[PDB]
Design an enzyme around this catalytic site. Structure first.
Site, short mmCIF file in Angstrom:
data_model
loop_
_atom_site.label_atom_id
_atom_site.label_comp_id
_atom_site.label_asym_id
_atom_site.label_seq_id
_atom_site.Cartn_x
_atom_site.Cartn_y
_atom_site.Cartn_z
N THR A 1 -4.29 7.75 -21.71
CA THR A 1 -3.69 6.38 -20.88
C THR A 1 -2.73 6.36 -21.52
O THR A 1 -1.54 6.73 -22.40
CB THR A 1 -4.98 5.44 -21.87
N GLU B 1 0.07 4.78 0.00
CA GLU B 1 -0.96 6.25 -0.37
C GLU B 1 0.21 7.34 -0.28
O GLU B 1 0.21 7.21 0.60
CB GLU B 1 -2.34 6.00 0.38
N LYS C 1 -3.14 1.83 -25.77
CA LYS C 1 -3.28 2.51 -26.58
C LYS C 1 -1.89 2.97 -27.84
O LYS C 1 -0.98 2.00 -28.03
CB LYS C 1 -4.40 3.67 -26.78
N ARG D 1 -1.82 -1.10 -19.07
CA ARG D 1 -3.34 -0.26 -19.07
C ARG D 1 -3.36 0.21 -17.68
O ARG D 1 -2.78 -0.23 -17.06
CB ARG D 1 -4.29 -1.52 -18.88
N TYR E 1 0.89 -1.18 -0.52
CA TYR E 1 0.00 -0.21 0.35
C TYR E 1 1.02 1.36 -0.07
O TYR E 1 1.63 1.93 0.67
CB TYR E 1 -1.11 0.11 1.38
N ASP F 1 -7.30 15.68 -23.94
CA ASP F 1 -7.47 14.16 -23.80
C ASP F 1 -6.11 13.56 -25.04
O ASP F 1 -6.95 13.04 -26.28
CB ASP F 1 -8.63 14.01 -23.25
#
Lengths: 402, 402
Positions: free
Chosen positions: A218, A48, A221, A227, A46, A192
């Protein structure tokens, strides 16, 4: 005990990918080393917060991984600030909108029917549920964006954010003009670039970083990464605002194994071979569109500047649902796609979208596009058949997978 | 060309995980086959939509993978509907809130300082930005939730949604009483079971499915799956509404390689060996808490019903920040945590939170908890030393990772 049933399905999907021609413009095949990083033990931690400012101890190595992805993204795109934590392109856009707007502000984006993405203001998406949306389209004659129409709508409606970028627009964007329009009304310009990010990285598409206030993307692509999402800016003070909306605003723990995969993908995109790949992506798309037009298909805008193009199937009596089904039946995957001013509802549509990043990764060259065009044409005119399925399979299998 | 710099860091993180004692309650170590699925070629496929109703061709195998994950989740938890697409616990909660509430509606959740999660109403999180928030806490004299106070707040503020579940609460929840309170004010009851989901799966914690309207979870933490989210319910009509908020509402393409990972984790959790693992998690936590109490620490609420417990460090005159630092310096990771009505500010605190899932996965058993308690105590009292670090490292290396 091994989960044999699940691993049998993974093997079947590997076989499907190997034996078919993947022409969906948003797909690609990632490298073994991207997969190795995503499959790593970094999922166990983790993390964070941000590098050197984490909630929990034990992140000293994770911080070096995340910082390496951040600094490579800055180097690759020429940005002063990057955030590599968004779980997807949708979360990247969500954090940017919530950092710049309040619910009920006006967002301007490209119309879904003209090629915009769901997150550019669709009413069934958070973008069109939380914000008032105004959309721009393309001209009915050239099928290009009309910057005079964009400017008129911005003066009339005074959006807070204007979004440029789309998921099915086949020509270059004029980012300098969009920024001039945003400046006339005091709007932020968000670009974008998810679809064409890898072409930007390779120098084959105008870079939005100098003109946009914020750029989202992203990492999959055309960038050919794992991803996930990405946010960039040339303004590190705006970047610090957006960092807070990613965490603690809209996400919790980041996926650090995926972030390690993003670092690897940025390293691959920095190599000279990625420029050669990207060049062939665009050459294959131009050539395949020309080979289809010579068979009498109508190409929206007459061609393409990038990795994708749209085919208007109205003249041949096909819906896009039908063409999508006939092609899938012989192992050629496309997606139906609304065309400009589409006579048919979005679950049916009148067109298909084709892109070449995935077959270019498998080593297809421009001299092979006449053969691909022949197979597409036959599937559409003659319908599926076992001989045609076998011809597709032979052609696909002759090209390696990464 | 291999990204040597990045893979050097992954080997360093592997070594860090192997050589340390991970006591942060949210952490776990996933199996090799979960990693293998997450590292698979399923990342290459865009699969917007749901099984049987996708927006791209070529999903016939992905549909079987996602359906397998759904059906295994339903069998594991005794649910009537599941959604396995949320990218994280935070996105699972976000979709449920947006399906059940409008911006400006009232949300009631456990206070962050008493153990609630960021997404249970914190003002820096979307939950406290979009909704009006009422929080409940614990009583100073019992250190437990007071269901009479929950009722009084719900009657006074009429929340639309009441959330039960927390990130740092060491006792069982009374889900029946919460559903009674929600029914009295016409609220939906959402249970966020992320922390204790594995214990619910193993039958060692009361199951919220019959009493909540909707249940959210992570698939990591005690369920020991890949990092991601999950939604369950006994009401398939409500589930169809939430499906629409996950997509096209707040996400785009799902991470189908992670979904295949979730399918493997649910398979592992359906095996009898997982019940034995979960029993040991709870026995280790009860035994470690007893062994620290015997050395002079006070355990909040006097013990625990689950995998985590909270240590009140006041008898030894330490703050939670000092304890975290001394322990991190010898390779034992914990996190500071406020005790009920802590006299110290929240960046300091008087306590720490410890959980056993991760060390139980590495084969620690209840007869080794005296030794772990001794190492913690020595680090807090003597401070870091090279010799103590080496004893931790030898103990860690003697217990293999998966």
């Amino acid at each position: 005990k091994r989960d044999e049933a699940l691993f049998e399905l993974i093997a079947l999907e590997e076989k499907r990918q190997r034996e078919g021609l993947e022409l969906i413009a948003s797909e690609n095949f990632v490298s073994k080393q991207v997969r190795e990083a995503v499959g790593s033990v970094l999922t166990n931690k983790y993390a964070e917060g941000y590098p050197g400012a984490r909630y929990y101890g034990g992140c000293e190595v994770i911080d070096r991984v995340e910082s390496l992805a951040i600094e490579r993204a800055k180097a690759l795109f020429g940005a002063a600030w990057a955030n590599v934590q968004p779980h997807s392109g949708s979360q990247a856009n969500m954090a940017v909108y919530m950092a710049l707007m309040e619910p009920g502000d006006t967002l301007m984006g490209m119309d879904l029917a003209a090629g915009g993405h769901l997150t550019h203001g669709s009413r069934v998406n958070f973008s069109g549920k939380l914000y008032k949306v105004v959309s721009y389209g393309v001209r009915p004659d050239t099928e290009l964006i009309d910057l005079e129409e964009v400017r008129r709508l911005a003066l009339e409606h005074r959006p807070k954010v204007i979004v440029a970028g789309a998921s099915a627009y086949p020509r270059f964007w004029d980012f300098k003009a969009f920024r001039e329009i945003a400046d006339e009304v005091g709007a932020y310009l968000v670009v974008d670039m998810a679809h064409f990010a890898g072409l930007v990285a390779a120098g084959l598409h105008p870079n939005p970083l100098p003109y946009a206030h914020v750029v989202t993307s992203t990492t999959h692509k055309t960038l050919r990464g794992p991803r996930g999402g990405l946010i960039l800016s040339n303004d590190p003070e705006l970047g610090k605002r957006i960092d807070k909306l990613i965490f603690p605003g809209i996400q919790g723990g980041p996926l650090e194994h995926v972030i390690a995969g993003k670092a690897v993908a940025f390293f691959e995109a920095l190599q000279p071979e990625f420029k050669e790949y990207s060049r062939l992506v665009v050459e294959n798309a131009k050539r395949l569109a020309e080979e289809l037009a010579r068979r009498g298909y109508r190409i929206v805008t007459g061609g393409t500047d990038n990795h994708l193009f749209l085919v208007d199937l109205r003249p041949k009596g096909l819906t896009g649902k039908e063409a999508e089904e006939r092609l899938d039946a012989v192992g050629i995957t496309v997606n139906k796609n609304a065309i400009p001013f589409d006579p048919k509802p979005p679950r049916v549509t009148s067109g298909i979208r084709i892109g070449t990043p995935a077959i270019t990764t498998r080593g297809f060259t421009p001299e092979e596009m006449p053969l691909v065009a022949e197979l597409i044409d036959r599937a559409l005119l003659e319908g599926p058949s076992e001989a045609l399925r076998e011809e597709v399979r032979r052609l696909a299998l002759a090209h390696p997978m990464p």
